[PDB]
Each structure stands twice: as C-alpha cells, then as structure tokens.
Amino acid sequence: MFDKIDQLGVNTIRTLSIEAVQKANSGHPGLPMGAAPMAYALWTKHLKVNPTTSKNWADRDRFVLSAGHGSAMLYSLLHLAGYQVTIDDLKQFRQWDSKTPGHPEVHHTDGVEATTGPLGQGIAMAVGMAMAEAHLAATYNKENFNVMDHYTYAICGDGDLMEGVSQEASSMAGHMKLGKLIVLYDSNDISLDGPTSKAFTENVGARYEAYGWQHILVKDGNDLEAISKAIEEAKAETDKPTLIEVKTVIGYGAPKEGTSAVHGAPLGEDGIKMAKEVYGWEYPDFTVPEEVAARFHQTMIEEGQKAEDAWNEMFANYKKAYPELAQQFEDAFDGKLPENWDAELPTYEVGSSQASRVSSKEVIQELSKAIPSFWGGSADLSGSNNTMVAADKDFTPEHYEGRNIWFGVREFAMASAMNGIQLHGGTRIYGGTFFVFVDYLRPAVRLAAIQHTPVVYVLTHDSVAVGEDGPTHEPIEQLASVRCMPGVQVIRPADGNETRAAWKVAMETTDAPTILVLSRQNLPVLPSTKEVADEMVKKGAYVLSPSQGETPEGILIATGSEVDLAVKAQKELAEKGKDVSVVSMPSFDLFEKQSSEYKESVLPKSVKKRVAIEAAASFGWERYVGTEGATITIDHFGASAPGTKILEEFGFTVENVVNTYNQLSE
Amino acid sequence: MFDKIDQLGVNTIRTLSIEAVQKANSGHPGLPMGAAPMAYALWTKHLKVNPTTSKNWADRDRFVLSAGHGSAMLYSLLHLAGYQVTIDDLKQFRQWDSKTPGHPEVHHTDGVEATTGPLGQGIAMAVGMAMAEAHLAATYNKENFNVMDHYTYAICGDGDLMEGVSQEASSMAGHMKLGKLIVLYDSNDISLDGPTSKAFTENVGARYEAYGWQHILVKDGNDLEAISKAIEEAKAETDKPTLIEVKTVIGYGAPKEGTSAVHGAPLGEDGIKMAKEVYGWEYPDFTVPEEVAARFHQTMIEEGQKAEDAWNEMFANYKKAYPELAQQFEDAFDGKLPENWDAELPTYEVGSSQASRVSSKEVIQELSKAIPSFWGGSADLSGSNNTMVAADKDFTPEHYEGRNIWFGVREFAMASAMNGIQLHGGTRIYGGTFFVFVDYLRPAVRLAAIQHTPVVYVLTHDSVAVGEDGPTHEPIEQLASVRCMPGVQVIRPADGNETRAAWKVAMETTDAPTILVLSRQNLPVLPSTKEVADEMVKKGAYVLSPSQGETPEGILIATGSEVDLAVKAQKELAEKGKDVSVVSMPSFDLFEKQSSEYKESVLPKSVKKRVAIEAAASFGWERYVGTEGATITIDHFGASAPGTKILEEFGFTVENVVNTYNQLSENLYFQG
Numbered sequence A: 001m002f003d004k005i006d007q008l009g010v011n012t013i014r015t016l017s018i019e020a021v022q023k024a025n026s027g028h029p030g031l032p033m034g035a036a037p038m039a040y041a042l043w044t045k046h047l048k049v050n051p052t053t054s055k056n057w058a059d060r061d062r063f064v065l066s067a068g069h070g071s072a073m074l075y076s077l078l079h080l081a082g083y084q085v086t087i088d089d090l091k092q093f094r095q096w097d098s099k100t101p102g103h104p105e106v107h108h109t110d111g112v113e114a115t116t117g118p119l120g121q122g123i124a125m126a127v128g129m130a131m132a133e134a135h136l137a138a139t140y141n142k143e144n145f146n147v148m149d150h151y152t153y154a155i156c157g158d159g160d161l162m163e164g165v166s167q168e169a170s171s172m173a174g175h176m177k178l179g180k181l182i183v184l185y186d187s188n189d190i191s192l193d194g195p196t197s198k199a200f201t202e203n204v205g206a207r208y209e210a211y212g213w214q215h216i217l218v219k220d221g222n223d224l225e226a227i228s229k230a231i232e233e234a235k236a237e238t239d240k241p242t243l244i245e246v247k248t249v250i251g252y253g254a255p256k257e258g259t260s261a262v263h264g265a266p267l268g269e270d271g272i273k274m275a276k277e278v279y280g281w282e283y284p285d286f287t288v289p290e291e292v293a294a295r296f297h298q299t300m301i302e303e304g305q306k307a308e309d310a311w312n313e314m315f316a317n318y319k320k321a322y323p324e325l326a327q328q329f330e331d332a333f334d335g336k337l338p339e340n341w342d343a344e345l346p347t348y349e350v351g352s353s354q355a356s357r358v359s360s361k362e363v364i365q366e367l368s369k370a371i372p373s374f375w376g377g378s379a380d381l382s383g384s385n386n387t388m389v390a391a392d393k394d395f396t397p398e399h400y401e402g403r404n405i406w407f408g409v410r411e412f413a414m415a416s417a418m419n420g421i422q423l424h425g426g427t428r429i430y431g432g433t434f435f436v437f438v439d440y441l442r443p444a445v446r447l448a449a450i451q452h453t454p455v456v457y458v459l460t461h462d463s464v465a466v467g468e469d470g471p472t473h474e475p476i477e478q479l480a481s482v483r484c485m486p487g488v489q490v491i492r493p494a495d496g497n498e499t500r501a502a503w504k505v506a507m508e509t510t511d512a513p514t515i516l517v518l519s520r521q522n523l524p525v526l527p528s529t530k531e532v533a534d535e536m537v538k539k540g541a542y543v544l545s546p547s548q549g550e551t552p553e554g555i556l557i558a559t560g561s562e563v564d565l566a567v568k569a570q571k572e573l574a575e576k577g578k579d580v581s582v583v584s585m586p587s588f589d590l591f592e593k594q595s596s597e598y599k600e601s602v603l604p605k606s607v608k609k610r611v612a613i614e615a616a617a618s619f620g621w622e623r624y625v626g627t628e629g630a631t632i633t634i635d636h637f638g639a640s641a642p643g644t645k646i647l648e649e650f651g652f653t654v655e656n657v658v659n660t661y662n663q664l665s666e
Numbered sequence B: 001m002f003d004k005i006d007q008l009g010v011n012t013i014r015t016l017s018i019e020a021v022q023k024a025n026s027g028h029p030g031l032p033m034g035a036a037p038m039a040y041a042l043w044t045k046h047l048k049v050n051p052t053t054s055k056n057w058a059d060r061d062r063f064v065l066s067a068g069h070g071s072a073m074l075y076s077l078l079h080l081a082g083y084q085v086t087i088d089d090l091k092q093f094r095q096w097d098s099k100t101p102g103h104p105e106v107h108h109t110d111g112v113e114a115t116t117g118p119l120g121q122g123i124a125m126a127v128g129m130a131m132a133e134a135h136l137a138a139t140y141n142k143e144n145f146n147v148m149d150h151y152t153y154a155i156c157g158d159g160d161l162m163e164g165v166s167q168e169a170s171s172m173a174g175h176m177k178l179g180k181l182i183v184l185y186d187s188n189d190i191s192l193d194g195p196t197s198k199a200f201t202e203n204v205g206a207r208y209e210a211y212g213w214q215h216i217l218v219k220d221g222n223d224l225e226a227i228s229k230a231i232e233e234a235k236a237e238t239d240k241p242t243l244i245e246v247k248t249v250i251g252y253g254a255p256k257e258g259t260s261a262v263h264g265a266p267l268g269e270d271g272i273k274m275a276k277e278v279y280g281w282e283y284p285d286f287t288v289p290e291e292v293a294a295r296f297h298q299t300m301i302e303e304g305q306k307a308e309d310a311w312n313e314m315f316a317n318y319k320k321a322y323p324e325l326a327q328q329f330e331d332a333f334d335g336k337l338p339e340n341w342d343a344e345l346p347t348y349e350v351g352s353s354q355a356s357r358v359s360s361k362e363v364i365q366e367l368s369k370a371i372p373s374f375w376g377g378s379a380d381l382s383g384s385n386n387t388m389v390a391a392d393k394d395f396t397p398e399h400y401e402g403r404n405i406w407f408g409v410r411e412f413a414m415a416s417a418m419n420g421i422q423l424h425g426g427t428r429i430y431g432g433t434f435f436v437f438v439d440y441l442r443p444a445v446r447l448a449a450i451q452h453t454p455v456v457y458v459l460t461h462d463s464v465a466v467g468e469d470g471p472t473h474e475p476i477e478q479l480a481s482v483r484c485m486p487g488v489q490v491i492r493p494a495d496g497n498e499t500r501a502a503w504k505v506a507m508e509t510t511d512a513p514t515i516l517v518l519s520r521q522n523l524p525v526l527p528s529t530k531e532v533a534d535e536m537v538k539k540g541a542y543v544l545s546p547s548q549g550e551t552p553e554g555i556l557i558a559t560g561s562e563v564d565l566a567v568k569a570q571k572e573l574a575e576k577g578k579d580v581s582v583v584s585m586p587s588f589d590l591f592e593k594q595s596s597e598y599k600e601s602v603l604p605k606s607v608k609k610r611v612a613i614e615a616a617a618s619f620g621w622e623r624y625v626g627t628e629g630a631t632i633t634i635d636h637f638g639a640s641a642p643g644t645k646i647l648e649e650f651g652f653t654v655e656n657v658v659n660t661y662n663q664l665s666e667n668l669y670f671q672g
C-alpha cells in the first residue's frame, strides 16, 4: 500500500514547491499543493523512467505537465526523482539563467519533456506522443520483442480543458483509440480569476466519454491509493484513452485553500507555516527527509535502472533477430536520414509549370519511400494540400504502421501533436493546412520555435491566386506574421526545383520548425533552379538571373510565384536598355544567417534601385528594398475572383513592375 | 404544414446553388443539396426576418451560415427571400466585384450577418450574438414590452464542430444557458478529404449534452416537417442551447452523393441533370418557379414587414413609457457615444508611475459609467488584465444585464463572440487576455479586420518585463504580427495619458478593430502627454520631446514602455551636446494614415540618424530607422527572471541607447 514515508514524500513536494515560490516572490503554489498526491503516486508507483539516463531512454513513459504553472511541483519531482535539479536550483526558481524557469522548458531543465506554459498544448503534445508510441510500436515491435511499450501521462487543469486545442486533441485521441494516454485532471474547481462555477460548468468526463475516452473520478485528491488504482484501470483500458479526474483542494493545507488566491501568488510565510501545521511538517526549509530520498531512490532510480537494463537486453536480442529494423529504430531516434534519401527526388525542366503543392507531393512521395521515419498528414486538406503518401496506409487504430495521418479539421491540435511527435523521437512529421489558417495553429508554431523542434509545416494556397474562395482564404499578412517570429524557418519555394530543395532544408533541419509556403497556382520553372537550387535555396536568397554587368543598375527581389514576373521584367527592361538582377529569396531567415559577403553578392549595397514583388504584405520589406526602394505588395485584403484576375488587378503584371522600377530610377 | 410547393422551394434552392457553382466552375454544391431542406424549413417557417429592411431591424432573428462553403445556398436563399441578390448576381458567383463571393462576406452582400469562411468562428459569432440579445433584452426589456425577443440560428457542418473555437464557444454557451441559440448541423458524414469515419468518430450530441445543450437528432434530412418540429422543440428549451443534428446525404440526387467529390467541386452538367431527375426538375436554368416565389413572398416578405411594424408600434409605446431607455436603445444601436463620455476620463501627472493595465482599468470603469452600451471581459485574466468594472455585475443567466463577462480560458471563442456581439449591435465590446496569446485568438482578429468590426482588444503583459513567467508568456514577434495585418489599429500606450487616448481612439473607431497593448510594469508619465496625448496619439506618431532647435541631429523613436528610456537618453545626449527628438509611435497604422507633411514633422527625411527602441521584434522598424539607422530590439525569445533584469541584459538601458546613437556617428555614412 502507501506508507507514512509516502505521505512525507507528497508533503516534501508540497513544501519544496511552496518554499520555492516564496523565495522567488513569484510563482503558482496552489496546484503543487493540490496535485502533489497524484504526482507522487504516478512517479513512485507507475511512471517508468530512468532518471540516471535522463531523456535518452526511448521507451521511457512520457509525462507532460500541461498545467505549466505547476512548474515548482515538477522541479520538486525531478529533484526527488534523481534528475539534475538541485535544492539550490530550486532556490533559484524564476531567476536569471536558472535551471528552474517559471514555466517548464524542454532542453533547459533535465527531465522536462515539453515546454508547457500555454494551456492545452501540453495535452495535445501528449496526444502526439501516444500517437508516436502506437506508430513506433506497430512499426518496430515483432513477436517476443516489445521494443515500444510505454504510456503517455499528462497532468492538466481546468484551463487546459477549456481550450479548443485540447478538445480537438481529445476527439482526435479518442478516434485514434490511444489507450496508453492517461491524463490526470487537477479538478481543483478553481481558476485564475475565481471558481470554475463562473465560466466552466460542463461535464468534462461526459465530453471525454463522447470523445471515446474512459473517465475515472477520484473524489479524494489526497487518497494516494485511489489514484494508483485509477491509473491501473486506465492501463487496463487498452482500447480507449483515459481521463482520471482528481478532485483536489487547490492550496491544500493553506489558509486560503479552495480560492483563486493560491493560484498564482506566493502563499506567504503565514500560509507555509499553517500548511505545514496541517502536514505536521516541522522539517527545515528546502530539506528532504532521508526516508523520502531513499523511497524515491528505490521507487525510481533503482527500479528505473532495472527496467532500462531489461529493455536494453531485449533490444540486444531484437537486433540479432531483426538487424535491419533495429538499426532503423536506432537511426530514426538519432535523427539520421537514410543514405541516398535525396537520390530519387524529383527534378524539373524549364518547359514545366507545376504548382508548388503538386511539386511538394512528389518530393513527399520519394521522401516517404526513402525515409521510413517520415510520416504526416493534413487538417482535412490532403487533396488540396497534396500531402498524401500513396503506396502507404492510413494511420488507424487497426494499422498504426500507417504513415498518413487524418488529423481532421483540428489544425492547432495537429500542430501541437506534431510538436509532441517530434519531441517523442523516432519520427519526422509533416502537417498540412492552408497558409491562411496558420493563424489557427500559430501558438503551436511559437512553441515549436521555443522548443527547437524540427517540425515541417506543409502550408499551401499561399496568395490571392486561390481566388474564388476570397479574402478569408487568401493569405496577405501571413508571410510577415511568421517572419517576425524568432526560431522559425519560413521558405516560399518559387518553382518545383526550389520546392524539392526547401524540403531538403527541412529534412536537414534539426533545431527549428520549418514552414513551407506552397502555391495552388501552377508555377513555371525558372532559369537556373534545376541546376543551382539544391545548393542555393539554403542560402535564403540567390541571384536567379544575373545582370549582364558585374554590378546591376537595379535589382528585383521576389519570392515564390512572383519570381516569374521578375525574370520577364528583366527582359522587358533590357529592351528599353535597363539591366537588372533578379534575386529569388525563398527564405528571409536562411539569408540572414549567411555571411556579409554572401549577402553582398545577392544584394550589393551600391544598388539602391531595389523593387520587390511579393503577393503579400509590405511589412519588413524595407530591410532589403530600403527606404528609397519600391515594392509591389498587397497591403489590403483579398477578393473573390479568378486568381489570375486578382493578381492582374493588384499590380502583379510585368508592365507594372517595369513602371515602378522606372519611376524609382527617376 | 408542408406541401409540394415547399419541396419545390427546397429543390429551387439546390438548383440555383449548383447551377451557380457550375457557371463559376468553382464552389461547393454538396452541402447546398443536402442542407437546402433544413435551410428552407428554418427560413420559411421559423426565421423572423424582414428582407425589405435588410439588416436594419434590431429585433430580427440572426442567421449565420457557419459553413461558408455553402455560400450559394445562402445567396439562393437571399434572392428567394426578397433580399437584394439578383439572379444576375448568382450568375456572377465567385467572379470579380460580384455581390456573390465564394464565401459569405458581411456588408458586401445584403442580409449576410457574418463573414464565415473559416470554420468554427461562425458558431462562436452566433454564441456572442445570443449573448448580445440576452444582455440587451435584460438591459432594455420592461414589463409588457418585448423590445428584444429574437433567436439566433446557425448552420454548421462537421468541420465547424471539429474546430476548437466551436468547442470553446459551445461550452461557454451552455454555461451561459443561451437557450435562444439554436445550431443546425449538417451531419452529412463527409469532409473535404473523405468520410468522417477517418477523423471524426465522436458523439457530437453527447459532448453537447455534457456542455449543457439539448440534442435533437433528425434522422431524415429531407423531412421538412421533422426539421421544423425540432426547431420548435429547441425554442421550447429556453434554459439550454440546442444542437439540431439533421442527418443529410451530401449532394442528394447527384451521382457522386455521399462522397467527398460533391463537397468542393462543381458536379458537372451531367451531375446537375441527374440530380434534377431525382428532383423532378424540368425547369430552365436559373429559374424560380412562380409557385415558389409567391410561397417565399407570403412566408417572409409579408409576415416579416408585419412583424417589424408590430415591433415598431410596441417600441413607440415603449418610447413613451420609458423614453430614457428607448433613446439609449436607439443610440446604442446607432453607435452614438453619450455626450460627455470623455469628460470624466482619467488624467495623469508627470510625478506618477502606473502600469497601462491599471490606467486602462481606470479608463474602462469611467467609460462603463458614461457609456451604458460598454461591456466586455477577459479569458480568466481579469486580475492580471485589470478589465473588471467594480460597479457592474457579472453577465450570468441570473443577471444578463451584467456587463462583466467571464469568457473563461477561451480566447478564440471570446474574440469570435466579440465579433458577433459587435455585428449584432447595441453594445461595445472589449476582450482581454495576455498579448502573447493573441496567437490563440488570431483568426478572429483577422475576421474582425475583414468585417470592419470595432471590437476592442485589451491585450496586456506586453514585453519581457513579464519576467518570471518566461519566454512562453513574454511577447516578442506579436506586435509586428498584427501591425503587418491589414485593417487593424494597434496602439502601444507609453503612459497613462496615452492609454486614455488609445481607448478614445478605439471608442471613436467605427470601421476597424483596435488592439491595445498594455504593460504589467509601471510606466512613468512622460513630459508632454497630459497636454498633447488626446490630440496626437490619434496621429500615430508624434514628437513627445522636441529637439533644442528646429532640425534635430537625431530621432530617438520609441513605443510604449521604452519611450521613457528615450527621454532619459535625450537628456544624457543633450548633456553631451547631442540634440535628438523623442518621437513616440503608439500606432504604425495611425501614423501612416496621416499626411505626407505631418510625417515629415514627426520624421524629417533630412535626419537619417535614427535609433528605435522597442522591446519587441525588429520587423518593420527599418521603415522608420532607415537602412543606416539602428534598432534596440529583441529578435529572440525571452527568459524567466525578474523583468527589470531581462530588460537590462537585453539592452533596454539608458547607456545602450546613448551608445547605439554614438556608434551611428562612427559610420562612414554620417561622416560628411
């Protein structure tokens, strides 16, 4: 059962958390106090992790604290568990260069599996982690070798479940029958501003039951045994994901328990003392009882070591029995793209005019054949986005080996799950939606930037050329909205050859989300792209068509579909005697990470006659065009019309670029 | 209650819709074919509208087509109703400058209450409209006067209900017991990519029942009587919102019915004819049967005018009985601000330091007192956003007159509901969360910009000064992310006086959403603001502190929290004989609106020594600092540390401002 030492451990977590919040004079103490029993039971009796090996173990049970305001409890848990969070690390909570940030951040603190500040994304990321385990289990598990047999756990709050991303993810998870996803809900019945009664009165468990989820109610948050029994029931439900609703008194033992006051402000030294009185805690501050430390050592370090060693031996036998597949497992988790992966990648010729999206599909198809760890889907847009791998099955409960994922019209959930799949390891994911609906998945793109996750976004329908669907479905500001974001690689391919090479950047990217901005409209193949694209797209901007002279009199900058106008302009300008360089800038960010010498080759400082043609906003174009430069952009919303007409009416004609260049030349 | 004329009316809606899609060679015919029965039953027998008065009747039932891909069904319906959509307009479906755009757009087309292309937002706008009815009903309705008694209707498809904004809003709707909101769900069991078996196996009704909704399942989508019966049941359940799931066959009649093919592509002429054979339609193309037109005229034109006229008589009697409330009702709907709304607004002194969030609370609360229509709330962040009005009560089922809305942690739903509230009219809406979570509500900001809807966004915690919550809670790219967007007014107030003016700009803005970017940290009151802010913040950028002498040697440009550093740096630079002008730029948008002449006053082209200091991404600052100017900016994510420290390490110190300017002298440019 659960002994007195076990309750000491619970209260150690409680005291460490609340002390850490107080020293910082910042932080959230209520959830740590309320959720400390459910956390303790999970880690000590049910979570299989080897703290000694950190996150290196592939089959570690995955735990996400979606309610990141409980960071102090997680740090308390990592310290007790044997991860490298020290007592002094706890004391530096919410301080400069601390290993204990106010909200958990992956790769900043040992043992944190996800960056979980924003609400609902952690659940969705945990959904994706179970998707990955089911997929990798089906892909690699053979009889007598359970190479992937682990559970995804999350601890959420009332806020996580009021967010659409979780609701989207939970319907997804229920559909995908993720029996190994166990979410613990800290139903403290309170939120930041007050009681759940003022805005959140739904039957969460019934909703989850409608999604296909098992719902277990533990009416006593402080009954460890009831929580441990619930986890076992959830593990027994192999066909359905499980929500264990743990009713807790936020700030348990504190004077202001069951109020919003304990949510986000330090309890105060009065609160700590009174809470300790309830616990009978007369221990010194930032002190862990010896009994507790040994309990955590036996329960987590010792058992964890035995489990990984056992798994490691099974993999040893697995490698002998199935050498090629085991190596694949190893290479996928280490992010090693297969040899000659790019060999059969499509190439295109000057006669051709193919949409960037069709070109993407072709790259995707060969990528899927070559890379067995490559998988992905769309938000009900695979036909429109051309994100489907023909010759591969769909990712279904019946065939988890399938690598085509039907996310549904759940873009945010797709994006966050994708972040979780990347975080899990063994897979490279892509996700498809229209470019205008990047808005829906934007917070998860920002999480991917912070988390340095090599997610690929296949976002199509880049411009007003979509046409008849109209302003709501035509991106204008979306290219700028991603470019300001730190940590995101945004590439708009200008032809098929640029598209192939953009995918190659994404495949070879290991620390950044990559957004691919692709076109519905058919894209004519440009002059040098067949030969130079693979080498020069990664440089962000290159001289697609050079001027006749060493120094161009002017320079035309263009991205994507509008680079064709540029080359046609170059010739018309030549007939009137003007010599201009045409630069393809697929990516702003890739270009800025290049040398000053390279930037000079593409955009020489001498030439102030810079005209930029982009079917997008003008924001940030003065960086390259200049104060004195000119730009053909759209700074207004779209229209419902044949796309060819909208472009023509919005100034994307060879004649207009000539006139604007000539006016600037004056 | 339904005759062959009514089925012919259903077939008419379908034929006009599929014929228009084919002429355009673009569109979605599937939902029109299967949903035209349910649309017909609701409009002809349960929807209280006067087509003659367009969108000008205040107690009109509100219909939102959340599934915008079924635009043609709406346009067909508008023509049949008596709205100003001609057969000729339908022919121009999805063509340049048409009154029939591919997805419905408000204002462009008669009687379209919302721009509803993006999925889920329409149901959320509908939810907010029901919120607006309840508040206005409670605020204005008095005994024997049913000033506000209108239901809110939305038609959605599977995709709408998969989206999280819908799920948030539905939870919010059930909590708020908006029993007069009824959603009609095309359970066609098909999505763009294919069946819903592949992505959508949930029990929608069970979820909606958990939300506190009522679920009526109509198994025969073609049975008009059953649909109408369900709409009656829904109106009967006044304490619960209702989802009427009408199971339909997508593309009923076409050869490709019940498949993904009918969703988003023209059937083709053969398909139109084959469906017509099932329909028994021998009529020529783009034709309304005379029987159907007269049936529509009777059901909606004549009855609707009688209802608006009956309402108008009651309102006039209400005007006599309650003149004050009636004038307020008209003026609130008219958008007229009360006469002395600006009079009691807070003013602040140089010796004062206060966070713009606290300044906003004070401006809000006085605005609430003077403007009865003014209401709003936050996504569980009122303590942090300072968005609560102390005098007023919460907007609860018990107190629908309350002007404090608790949206919960539902930012997307809040912003879309806000859009519905403003579109409905009678109220001014503010909604609050952290500025870093605009990303959560971003699609609804865009829809507001396209809809020209004057929603006010109170987005606080603007910088790395948030501090210990960390990178995830600290905005960086967000300012540029909305300054890049068309049709949005983004004001970063630099002190309390600018904050008041910012609110004023938003209260006087009728054509655009306004985002107010406010600070957790205390902002010291700046030199000229108590006197010049009321007239100069509206100009976007102004010279807060002029140079000593007409032509400045440099421009220190700063927005929001960072302007104080610029003024302090001006002093230090002035002490060393360097004369710079401090330009405060609350809004990029408002400044570019001003005359070419005014811009030269604020930013003379002659002065090329410019340093811009803003604790945000450098994106788009090259427009003002210039190629040879410099920026003190954050192009990287933040940290978890006390906020003052983060700012110092990131260079928002007086020394760095001085030194960045001085290094500008070292350049070869600026030598000469």
Ligand SMILES: Cc1ncc(C[n+]2csc(CCOP(=O)(O)OP(=O)(O)O)c2C)c(N)n1
Pocket: A028, A030, A031, A067, A069, A117, A118, A119, A156, A157, A158, A159, A160, A186, A188, A190, A191, A192, A193, A250, A263, A264, B379, B380, B381, B409, B437, B440
């Ligand atoms: C998307 C998002 N919006 C807002 C916040 C701010 N926030 C953090 S916790 C919280 C309250 C949610 O309540 P709950 O999870 O029940 O908290 P508890 O009572 O357990 O502390 C809010 C609004 C956030 N972290 N993420």
Ligand SMILES: Cc1ncc(C[n+]2csc(CCOP(=O)(O)OP(=O)(O)O)c2C)c(N)n1
Pocket: A379, A380, A381, A409, A437, A440, B028, B030, B031, B067, B069, B117, B118, B119, B120, B156, B157, B158, B159, B160, B163, B186, B188, B190, B191, B192, B193, B250, B263
């Ligand atoms: C937010 C958003 N995501 C995606 C799309 C693209 N889209 C339009 S309809 C649709 C399929 C949804 O199917 P459903 O609403 O059930 O359509 P029906 O079968 O009734 O035509 C998709 C993905 C969109 N318009 N908005």
Ligand SMILES: [Mg+2]
Pocket: A157, A158, A159, A186, A187, A188, A189, A190, A191
């Ligand atoms: Mg809670």
Ligand SMILES: [Mg+2]
Pocket: B157, B158, B159, B186, B187, B188, B189, B190, B191
């Ligand atoms: Mg459908």
